[PDB]
Design a protein around this nucleic acid. Structure first.
Lengths: 89, 68, 200, 93
RNA sequence: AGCAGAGUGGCGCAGCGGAAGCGUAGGUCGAUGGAUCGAAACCAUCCUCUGCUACCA
RNA sequence: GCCCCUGAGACACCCUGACGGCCGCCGCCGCCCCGCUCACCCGGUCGCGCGGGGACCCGCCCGGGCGGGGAGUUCGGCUGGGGCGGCGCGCCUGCUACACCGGACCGCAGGCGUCCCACGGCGGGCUCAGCGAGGACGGAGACCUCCCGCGGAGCAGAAGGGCACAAGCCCGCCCGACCCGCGCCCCCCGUGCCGGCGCGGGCCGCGAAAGCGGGGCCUACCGAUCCUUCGCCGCCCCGGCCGCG
RNA sequence: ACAGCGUCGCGAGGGCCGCACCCGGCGCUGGCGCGACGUGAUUUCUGCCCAGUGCCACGACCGUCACCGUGAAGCGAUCCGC
RNA sequence: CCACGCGCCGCGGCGAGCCCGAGGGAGCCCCCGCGGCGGAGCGAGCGCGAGACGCCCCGGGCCCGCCAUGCCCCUGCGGGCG
């Protein structure tokens, strides 16, 4: 156990306030990425995830991204970003 | 590449744990070693920081800011 | 796996099938369950739970069968069956469903026991008190060594939706008697006795 | 030595003597994810050669055979260690 | 240990479920179980044997 | 075509499964070849009026071999010096061992590392090895008989103990050759271990019961820490919670 | 040690050595050469054995024998095949 | 010999307490000065958690935790009483 057992925990009023909205991506940054996306296209691995996504092979895509990036959160989120391109097509 | 120990005839005599010449990896990065190489070449200047500018199969290139 | 498209195809087949269709919904529904991941040496073989039928019984069970009109017979033919091995097979092949008598089951264990066991069709003993018709209503999941699995969904004229429920009940049971379950099945088709296959 | 296919023995879950099927116990394959195996693969990682003793002086010719008695009713699993023996068979049903 | 392949007349050795032969009278087809209408054969289990590889029991 | 026909499998009709084989197809996945020059790599020259290769090698990173060419180390003990051999190097019986107990010996005669779901448990019945004298074949010899039978037989294997309405033999059931928690003895520092033994509480077996049974009559027949593997029930994963681990 | 005698490897993109690397020796060389070994001037000769153990095959690639790559499965660590 | 750690003995101060810690204080031997150690144990942990005697010593009895087990019942794989 990592917490002391006090049933009446709460002797002082607590001002827990992160007072923070989730960090906004920011409109200007999205615009700069759009200009770069036109100039640079997409990385070879991203195109291969898109081809696996165009065919219905989503587990293959997640496994290929998890090998490419090395973290499930960023593998899933890359699969869901690149899927918009294939879904738009 | 990876560090190769400077042992003559490629043999390190001693406890077998300290054996091994070709498999060792550098302690400092190739960014740090680039910074240390220019510092010897240019002892008078003061090294600020370095940035990576290119990489090939055999070589890696780092550009160092040096201040007079 | 929408039931309606296939059920509607069976309803369209009511005009299309025609055929002799004795006691049938214009056809006897059949299912060809394709299997992937199936090996003969690997053992996923599970023998687990209108066609012509026979009941051989004593007093009351035969009398109820007589009013129903279901076949009613006696143990006397078992000496004649013993004379002709082919005759025991002839009795078995003609009547797809076999029923006997609990009271006369001693006769069915020795007099009928060898030929009917070799044939693989066993009469189901029905005592006079017991009702044969309700047992007949009760009248299959098998894997054997064949990847293709074939079973008559329903020889009944019962609505295609009731027939669809019978297909569903066996598919889930097959998923239970399969290592990868639904994954193991590949392609299944529904067709009328002379009708075209329609993938599920 | 011949062991019977079924022996009636006490099953702890039921708490009563019940019929138990018999079956030879075999050591399972070693898991890479084990306290010792994780430590051993780290110790043997790198230069220095073997870091752990490798026994090479076998002397026992026989092992001790454990029979897994599995109760049909409670699925209780009990193990009976027989005396060391060169050959063992479990009678068929 | 793992992965293969073998074990058959007196001797050796073919036979791919449907004569058990040939070469030099002559069959626990190493046995056991299953499986099949029937296996030397398929499938297990073991007694082996061979080749290769593996190592804190 | 059926109802035939009798076959492992029923050959009117319709649909699919396997097994091959043969096209084809695919924004699919491996593999192999051939250019080209533009990295890369050489030769020539006083770059004086030129070539040879080439996406290959090489280098680097993982991976598998070969590798006393080298390193680092090890290479037991007991013992009429040591070696050679053996093993009082773990365990057991009768000795030598000197009548409690304890006594050394490269002292003696021997064993053990196994074998048995019966060669176990229990109850009932029975008597064994053999003399003598008898009974077609049948004789030294089987088989069937009576008698008298202290065990002269048997009890898995060494030796010594033990045992007769039995501990032997046969027969009928059975699995206690279970589960849980302790103590005692032998060796002994009086520590472990093997082996036994005595119990408290479950659940069983056999027997009419009383009883007896945690193997095989007793004395031999085996094994720390760590690691692994498995079973039984729970706890923990430390800011939580859930599945896996 | 020697002259002599054999054996062995090698056509330079090569062989054999050096060497922490960078890179050198043979080599201002080239098979009448260079490197590696035996035996040891003549004279007369050098039999048999490829079992074993070495060595050798652009001799095959049968069985094993790695990363990678790949194909299922999984929530994913992973796990099986190929 | 000295340092350091551990065991035991004796002695001094104080007592369910005890203590020149580092430090600070115009301040050197003075004053002030936390952890810690003891006062509760046991259990892998979850966790739970001591009174009944007793000049002393020992032995017995009982209580606490761990390990079972039987009942009872609240706020319930929870509590209690054996």
């Amino acid at each position: 156990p990592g917490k002391v057992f006090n049933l009446k925990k709460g002797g002082a009023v607590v001002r827990i306030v992160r007072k923070k909205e989730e960090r906004k991506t920011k409109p200007h940054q999205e615009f700069v990425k759009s200009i770069i996306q036109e100039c640079t296209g997409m990385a070879p691995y991203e195109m291969h995830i898109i081809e696996l996504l165009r065919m219905n092979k989503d587990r293959h895509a997640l496994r290929y991204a998890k090998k490419r990036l090395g973290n499930i959160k960023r593998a899933k989120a890359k699969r869901d970003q690149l899927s918009v391109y294939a879904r738009n097509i | 590449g990876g560090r190769k120990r400077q042992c003559v005839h490629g043999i390190s005599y001693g406890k077998p744990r300290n054996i091994g010449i070709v498999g060792l990896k550098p302690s400092r990065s190739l960014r740090a070693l680039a910074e240390q190489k220019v510092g010897r070449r240019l002892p008078s200047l003061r090294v600020l920081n370095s940035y990576w500018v290119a990489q090939d199969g055999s070589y890696k290139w780092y550009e160092v800011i040096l201040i007079d | 796996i929408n039931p309606e498209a296939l059920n509607k195809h069976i309803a369209e087949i009511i005009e299309r099938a025609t055929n002799e269709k004795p006691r049938k919904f214009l056809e006897t529904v059949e299912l060809q369950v394709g299997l992937k991941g199936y090996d003969p040496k690997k053992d996923p073989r599970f023998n687990l739970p209108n066609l012509k039928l026979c009941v051989i019984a004593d007093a009351r069970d035969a009398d109820r069968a007589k009013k129903l009109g279901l076949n009613y017979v006696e143990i006397e033919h078992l000496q004649q069956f013993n004379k002709d091995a082919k005759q025991i097979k002839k009795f078995a092949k003609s009547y797809d469903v076999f029923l006997a008598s609990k009271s006369l089951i001693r006769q069915i264990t020795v007099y009928a026991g060898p030929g009917f066991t070799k044939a693989g069709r066993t009469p189901l003993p029905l005592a006079p008190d017991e009702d044969l018709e309700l047992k007949v209503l009760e009248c299959k999941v098998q894997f054997k060594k064949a990847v293709g699995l074939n079973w008559p969904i329903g020889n009944v004229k019962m609505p295609a939706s009731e027939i669809a429920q019978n297909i569903m009940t066996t598919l889930n049971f097959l998923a239970t008697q399969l290592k990868k379950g639904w994954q193991n099945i590949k392609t299944v088709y529904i067709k009328s006795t002379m009708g075209p296959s329609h993938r599920i | 030595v011949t062991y019977p296919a079924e022996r009636r023995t006490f099953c702890k879950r039921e708490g009563k003597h019940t019929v138990h099927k018999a079956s030879l116990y075999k050591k399972g394959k070693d898991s890479l994810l084990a306290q010792g195996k994780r430590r051993y693969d780290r110790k043997q990682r790198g230069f220095g050669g073997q870091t752990k003793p490798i026994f090479r002086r076998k002397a026992k010719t026989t092992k001790k055979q454990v029979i897994r008695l599995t109760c049909s009713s409670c699925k209780c699993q009990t193990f009976q260690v027989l005396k060391r023996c060169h050959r063992l068979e479990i009678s068929r049903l």
